[PDB]
Design a protein around this nucleic acid. Structure first.
Lengths: 335, 114, 225, 35, 415, 104, 137
RNA sequence: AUGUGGAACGGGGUAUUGUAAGCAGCUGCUGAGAUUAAGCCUUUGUUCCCAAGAUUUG
RNA sequence: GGAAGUCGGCAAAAUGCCACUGUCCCUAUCUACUAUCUAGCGAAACCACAGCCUGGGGAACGGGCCAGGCAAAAUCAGCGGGGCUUGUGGCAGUCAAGCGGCGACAUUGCUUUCCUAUCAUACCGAAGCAGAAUUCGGUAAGCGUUGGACCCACUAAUAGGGACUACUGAUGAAGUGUCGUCGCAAUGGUAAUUCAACUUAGUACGAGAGGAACCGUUGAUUCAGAUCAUUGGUAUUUGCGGCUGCCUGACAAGGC
């Protein structure tokens, strides 16, 4: 048959997955970010102790396939305020920063080389010489606007890719009052927000991407999709040589498998280990958001203790995690 | 958490790789990859396969013995009570083994080449 | 004697093991089963909430006495490490790399005498004598090789198939130096080892066992004092 | 079978969202929020 | 003989409405004049056939669920004649069967004629002529269906007497202390009032003695109730436990009770009679005792004593008629059995559960009971792997000395 | 049954679904080395027995094990006769013939 | 009679033995062959031949056996499987031959001693088979 | 449209295969040798190329 | 797994009751060609005029009429679509509301999508419905209604019925100064389904036999959307190795 909820089955008009819904804003909660933006590096598998009471393998080892996506810390480069109207949300104003790096300026041109690199010259010039206009616009946001969404762009420079145009999107700011959001937004201009300060290794997020294009079978694949209930297993830091070492493994190692991730590269930044599949192929930008709703199903609450992570060679049939161990087992080569 | 040695190549089998095959003789065979599984299916003798550890040790391409550091390793079937002091030294002694074994086999290959 | 069931199953000889020194029960399922064992032996012997090879059938997968306990080669290093940590020092624990992994279905042992499925390997017989410190007899019960499941045995008695002949009962009892009874359990369930678990002072039987058998086990195993 | 569109499944789902089940989501976001 | 499994009978009007409503709802409804005559014929034959199947299906259910008086144990068979007049029940059950064939014949006839239908109307009236006839056939059994429903209603109330198991039938004059013995022996609650004929019908009650189950079936005193008592005593392998009012507090003369017992002796033949002297604390007796079968057991009805002794005597009569040093720990010799009331019973893991969220929520701490030098490390994670090598293979309590006995050796090789 | 074909063709398992050795509780069938040498039906023994045992207690088995004809490869192959190639089976048959010729 | 007296619950695993398949008799009850005719607990999956797996119950006919056990279709427990199935532990298992045991609907098996290896899954589910098993891996 | 620029080779890593000729007495040089991106990772390695043309644009 | 597909050994496979086989469960992968696009060459049938849909127009209701829904250029590739009727028989007599002799009921004589009229799942009311199981009835079409020769099982259940344009994807000029980034959301579509396992229990209820539920939790069936870490399959990586045949007077060397 085929579900009727996913038609017209046509190519997505976007490459970066659009967040069509943000969590409900509650002023009792103070300020936080609600989304993020990463790159699917690839997937591996893990071994985990399963602390689910009543499950047939309570307190027993399982094996789980996990998706590793690299998320270099996003950089906040603007603030936007939406006003409630009878005709729907309407973007009232937009305010930017001074130093917009070349990575995000590339997003504004189809040809960065041939351009005169003239983006944001007058705005940045007037930004420095007269900040009263910026203050007036932020005053407007905190006086009229009800939804505050910050421009944040990902540092695609650090990713082991060939693209140079940074990705740009609007993260909403749930928490506090509208003034609190604007103060939070203004205090993070030209600074970077790290994923460790957005997700915490155990929560259950919703992953949004564009599916891998299978071709023409009408159109098949390359559709916008939204996996729900994707659970974080481990938020690793790119600076530590222990990001792929558990408490049951030691064995100083890095999440990148033997020989680099297939068709992606070497992950040397902050990464996220989600469970199971995620939409899209490798090296496609994925969007991560907090779950729109509170569901405390026991799978969403139970803690995770990874026992062992796999860094064998995914390019074939790998059988050695680390080059040191390969040398210890294999006899000394002629080289 | 046990990394068993494959029956054919004698190479370590990490969780998630390879196959389990149980003989009707209640004997269990672990294979690291499909290459070794298929070779066993045609019933090639590992002593006569050019890329297995059993073949290599049948022709003396590795040292016959390493009683390294006066004790190296043994499969234990009578477990021991857990102790933080004992685990610490075993953790240190284990990695002190590998460098000794590597150091000795380096000179072993040097002797073999000459 | 006691009537107890694991989950809603009467075969508590499968889901648990009990000796004069310890008690092994299944995990993650009914902790009510742990409570039942703890209610009668909690302050006397340790009650281990364990598993063997990621299964709840540890009773039929192990064999042990007051002195030593045996597990099959299928048990993990983690589960074996768990058992040794929880169990006290005087009880020795070993991995029996033996032909028929299910030790409970082939070996029924006490502190002094054990009965084994004749089809065991010689090294297994040697280590059983070394560990259990019992004399090993490669005999059969009721013509069935599964001694452990068809012969529920303890220090003060034993139960076997009702089918086995009187001369066979006398031979087994004399060679075991203990009184023996040919009884039933769980309303005609002839798997006496799988339905009844016995130590020298307490015994547990399935909920479906009628009063007539319960009186019989009480008489043979003399729990009244 | 009680379907997830059931008003009483939805009603009891609510009461789970008002126990410590959601408290481990309220202060759980406060973790990052002080960073 | 559990007679509770019989489906409840409709009262004709509902029976027809249920049958007719099913035919309307489950079979097609719309047809036009312009359709092929074969389709018109096929449509109406389906309804006529369908109602016949519905009627027969309901009728067969009655005929099968009711118990066949000839094929059953004569205890219940003789019980049913006194209660239900086997001829009347058999006439009722047979009439429904004659009904069952009659609906079949009419259905076969009108289906057969309908094959020759020429217009939509002529088939319409045969279908109406059909539905009228099986409707009129059923309406004639109004008395039969009502009688069976009343019989069904009382059958489901009857207790399933046990003929195979050992039994102890109790009989005698009304209010002769039989009710007190039944209440004290059986867990059943039979109403005891000064009004006579309180035991309207038989009351069954199971009791456990000598590791065996015995069924005590109290019978009505002594007539329909007397006939039921006589039939119950007629075919029942049980020991007679007649209770005689020695003190005459039951309102009946002792000689009258003796005469009744002598009259019932013909039914009490080949049975272990009991000469219960009811109200002992509160002549013909010698003649009754001369039989020998009846055991003279005094029963203090007013003092409520001897009931247990009488039951023990009756059960005994019915039975007659039919080096390994077990080093138990010292704590076992002085162990307090876990009983919930006393706080003494040590808490159990079941109780730690209910305080901590119940089944499916409470995570048992498996590490919480290791015999270990310390209860803090009691949640630590032990290394399992390092550099291709398992931690487990190296755990040795003296391994440090193997490491020092080494240090000399490598220091020798470098030198 | 056609056990000679299975012995001579170690590959191409025939998807045998017939039964379990007529109520044989253990599948670990062992054939004595002295009996195997003295056997006049090597095909049946090879197709049925899962291993050829040479116990040290038996004098004939010990002599055959210590014999120069029986080499390390022969003993290793005979330890697990369930997994043995066509060449190994031919080598085992040749070794049995060589031992039988020496004996008589 | 399906899923009855099987203790806990069975994880999903690959389907090895469709309808009308031959398995060896694994116990010493006296049978040799079993023939699958129906599979318990199969839904309304259009054009799906019901299939069996380790620890599953199927209506079986003793194709080869003594005539008394024949001529009566009755449930049987598939004790082994040739198709590769993966445990939740992650390792992939498979046996040489498809084997099954002869069992009454309640759960007590009719045999006295089963032959060869036993699937660890069916030993977990079926305590009666675990009572009468020789070696389980 | 001159840069952690891009390309063509090459090296290393990872892999697939199963030990290349020749020499010496089946064995050793030989887990060798070959292939490795065509939809693998990486490159201070060598060389080149680019600081263009046309069109449409208030 | 080996005839469960199909009326069926149709066609291959097995060689030159047993056994083999992708007929099927359930399809997947690989190769060539057509296919598509480009340069060139280049028809004919057919043609009143045209081409959105609902209802109505006495008929034949239609593509034009009427009343509505609506309606934004140019295209590319696929698919060929085009006031009936029901749940209750016939003869005779008796009443008798009443009307003008009939006389009403009653009485006696004999013989893909859609519909709900719901099989299952949700809830509900009644029944001698103790518990369990069940019967009847009501709301209800969200959601399922199977596999093999009337049958024989599974299953929660295997309920009864009607019937050029569009469709599916792909580009696309254009107002609003131009181009671009980030967004808003009118409207359209929509998705989940059933089972049983642990408790709660051998408790409520029952002489006993038997024996539930709410709640919490755990897997499975079916359906949908994704994904390729693992295992499996596929081979033109013609990647490596082995074998067969051929060549240089010879070895090597490759060769096809």
């Amino acid at each position: 048959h085929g579900s009727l909820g996913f038609l017209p089955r046509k190519r997505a008009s976007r490459q970066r997955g659009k967040v069509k819904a943000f969590p409900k804003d509650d002023a009792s909660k103070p300020v936080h970010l609600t989304a993020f933006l990463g790159y699917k590096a690839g997937m591996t598998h893990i071994v985990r102790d399963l602390d689910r009471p009543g499950s047939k393998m309570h307190k027993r080892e399982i094996l789980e396939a996990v998706t590793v996506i690299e998320t270099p810390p996003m950089v906040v480069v603007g603030v936007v305020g939406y006003v409630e109207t009878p005709r729907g949300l309407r973007s009232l104003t937009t305010v930017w920063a001074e130093h917009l790096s070349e990575e995000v300026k590339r997003r504004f041109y189809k040809n960065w080389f041939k351009s005169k690199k003239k983006a944001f010259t007058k705005y940045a010039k007037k930004y420095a010489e007269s900040t009263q206009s910026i203050n007036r616009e932020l005053e407007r946001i905190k006086k009229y606007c009800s939804v505050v969404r910050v421009l944040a762009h990902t540092q695609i420079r650090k990713t082991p890719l060939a693209q140079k145009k940074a990705h740009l999107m609007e993260i909403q700011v749930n928490g506090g009052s509208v003034a609190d959001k604007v103060e939070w937004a203004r205090e993070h201009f030209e600074k970077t927000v790290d994923i460790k300060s957005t997700f915490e290794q155990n929560e259950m997020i919703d992953v949004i991407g564009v599916t891998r294009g299978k071709g023409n079978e009408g159109n098949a694949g390359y559709m916008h999709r939204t996996q729900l209930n994707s659970k974080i297993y481990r938020i690793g830091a790119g600076d530590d040589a222990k990001n792929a070492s558990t408490d049951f493994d030691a064995t100083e190692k890095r999440i990148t498998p033997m020989g680099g991730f297939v068709r992606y590269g070497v992950v040397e930044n902050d990464f996220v280990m989600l469970n199971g599949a995620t939409p899209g192929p490798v090296k496609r930008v994925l969007t991560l958001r907090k779950s729109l709703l509170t569901h405390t199903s026991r799978k969403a609450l139970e803690p995770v203790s990874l026992k062992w992570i796999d860094t064998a060679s995914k390019f074939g049939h790998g059988r050695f995690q680390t080059p040191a161990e390969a040398k210890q087992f294999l006899g000394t080569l002629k080289k | 958490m046990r990394v068993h040695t494959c029956y054919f190549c004698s190479g370590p089998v990490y969780p998630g790789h390879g196959i389990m095959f149980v003989r009707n003789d209640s004997k269990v065979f672990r294979f690291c990859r499909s290459k070794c599984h298929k070779n066993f299916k045609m019933k090639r003798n590992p002593r006569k396969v050019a890329w297995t550890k059993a073949y290599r040790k049948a022709h003396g391409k590795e040292m016959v013995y390493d009683t390294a550091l006066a004790v190296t390793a043994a499969r234990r079937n009578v477990p021991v009570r857990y102790d933080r002091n004992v685990i610490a030294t075993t953790l240190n002694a284990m990695k002190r083994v590998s460098q000794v074994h590597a150091k000795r086999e380096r000179l072993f290959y040097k002797k073999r080449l000459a | 004697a006691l009537r107890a069931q694991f989950e809603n199953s009467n075969e508590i000889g499968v889901f648990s093991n009990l000796t004069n020194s310890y008690a092994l029960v299944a995990l993650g399922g009914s902790e009510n089963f742990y409570s039942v064992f703890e209610a009668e032996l909690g302050d006397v012997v340790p009650v281990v909430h364990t598993t063997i090879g990621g299964t709840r059938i540890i009773g039929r997968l192990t064999c042990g006495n007051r002195k030593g306990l045996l597990v099959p080669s299928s048990t993990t290093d983690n589960e074996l490490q768990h058992l040794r940590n929880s169990l006290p020092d005087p009880v020795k624990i070993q991995r029996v790399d033996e032909r028929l992994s299910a030790l409970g279905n082939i070996v029924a042992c006490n502190d002094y005498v054990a009965l084994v499925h004749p089809d065991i390997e010689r090294e297994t017989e040697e280590i059983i004598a070394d560990v259990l410190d019992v004399e090993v007899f490669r005999q059969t019960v009721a013509g069935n090789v599964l001694t452990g499941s068809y012969c529920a045995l303890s220090n003060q008695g034993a139960l076997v198939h009702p089918r086995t002949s009187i001369q066979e009962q006398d031979e087994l009892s004399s060679l075991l130096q203990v009184p023996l009874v040919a009884g039933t359990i769980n309303r005609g369930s002839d798997v006496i080892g799988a339905g009844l678990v016995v130590n020298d002072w307490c015994a547990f039987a399935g909920l479906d066992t009628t009063a007539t058998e319960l009186a019989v086990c009480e008489s043979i195993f003399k729990l009244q004092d | 079978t009680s379907g997830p569109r059931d008003n009483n499944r939805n009603k009891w789902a609510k009461k789970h969202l008002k126990k410590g089940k959601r408290a481990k989501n309220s202060n759980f976001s406060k973790f990052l929020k002080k960073k | 003989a559990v007679f509770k499994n019989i489906t409840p009978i409709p009262d004709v009007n509902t029976f027809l409405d249920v049958v007719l409503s099913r035919t309307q709802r489950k079979t097609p409804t719309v047809i036009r004049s312009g359709f092929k005559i074969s389709r018109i014929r096929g449509f109406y034959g389906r309804k006529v056939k369908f109602t016949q199947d519905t009627i027969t299906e309901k009728l067969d259910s009655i005929l099968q669920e009711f118990p066949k008086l000839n094929d059953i144990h004569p205890f219940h068979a003789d019980l049913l004649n006194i209660l239900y007049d086997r001829d009347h029940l058999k006439i009722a059950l047979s009439q429904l069967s004659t009904a069952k064939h009659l609906v079949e014949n009419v259905a076969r006839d009108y289906i057969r004629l309908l094959k020759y239908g020429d217009s939509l109307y002529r088939c319409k009236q045969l279908k109406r002529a059909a539905l009228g006839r099986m409707a009129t056939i059923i309406k004639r059994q109004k008395s039969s269906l009502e009688f069976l429903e009343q019989v069904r209603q009382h059958l489901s109330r009857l207790p399933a007497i046990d003929p195979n198991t050992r039994t102890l039938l109790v009989c005698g004059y009304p209010n002769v202390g039989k009710s007190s013995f039944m209440n004290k022996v059986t867990r059943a609650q039979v109403d005891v009032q000064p009004y006579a004929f309180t035991t309207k019908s038989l009351f069954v009650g199971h009791f456990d003695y000598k590791y065996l189950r015995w069924q005590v079936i109290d019978t009505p005193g002594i007539n329909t109730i007397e006939m039921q008592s006589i039939t119950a005593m007629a075919h029942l392998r049980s020991a007679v436990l007649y209770f005689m009012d020695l003190s005459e507090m039951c309102g009946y003369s002792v000689a009258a009770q003796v005469k009744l017992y002598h009259s019932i002796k013909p039914l009490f033949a080949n049975k272990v009679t009991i000469l219960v002297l009811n109200k002992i604390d509160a002549e013909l007796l010698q003649t009754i005792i001369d039989d020998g079968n009846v055991k003279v057991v005094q029963t203090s009805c007013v003092q409520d004593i001897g009931v247990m002794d009488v039951r023990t005597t009756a059960c005994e009569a019915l039975l007659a008629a039919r080096a390994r040093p077990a080093c138990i720990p010292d704590s076992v010799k002085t162990r307090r059995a876990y009983d919930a009331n006393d706080p003494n019973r040590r808490i159990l893991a079941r109780d730690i559960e209910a305080a901590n969220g119940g089944a499916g929520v409470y995570n048992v701490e498996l590490r919480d009971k290791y015999i270990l030098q310390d209860p803090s490390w009691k949640y630590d994670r032990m290394p399992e792997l390092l550099d291709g090598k398992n931690v487990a293979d190296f755990v040795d309590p003296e391994i440090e000395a193997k490491l020092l006995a080494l240090d000399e050796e490598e220091e020798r090789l470098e030198r | 049954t056609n056990v000679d074909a299975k012995v001579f063709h170690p590959e191409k398992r025939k998807r045998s679904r017939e039964g379990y050795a007529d109520d044989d509780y253990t599948l670990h069938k062992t054939v004595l080395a002295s009996e195997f040498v003295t056997a006049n039906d090597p095909i049946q023994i090879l197709g049925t027995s899962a291993e050829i045992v040479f116990p040290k207690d038996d004098e004939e088995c010990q002599r055959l094990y210590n014999l120069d004809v029986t080499t390390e490869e022969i003993l290793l192959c005979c330890s697990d006769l369930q997994v043995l190639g066509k060449k190994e089976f031919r080598d085992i048959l040749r070794w049995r013939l060589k031992i039988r010729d020496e004996m008589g | 009679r399906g899923r009855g007296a099987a203790s806990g619950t069975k994880y999903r695993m690959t389907l090895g033995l469709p309808v009308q398949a031959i398995m060896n008799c694994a116990d010493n009850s006296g049978a040799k062959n079993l023939y699958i005719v129906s599979v318990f607990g199969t839904g309304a999956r259009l054009n799906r031949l019901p299939a069996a797996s380790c620890g599953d119950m199927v209506l079986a006919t003793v194709k080869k056996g003594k005539p008394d056990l024949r001529k009566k279709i009755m449930p049987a427990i598939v004790v082994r499987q040739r198709k590769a199935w993966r445990r939740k532990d992650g390792v992939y298992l498979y046996f040489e031959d498809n084997a099954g045991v002869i069992v009454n609907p309640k759960g007590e098996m009719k045999g006295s001693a089963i032959t060869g290896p036993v699937a660890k899954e069916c030993a977990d589910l079926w305590p009666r088979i675990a009572s009468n098993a020789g070696t389980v891996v």
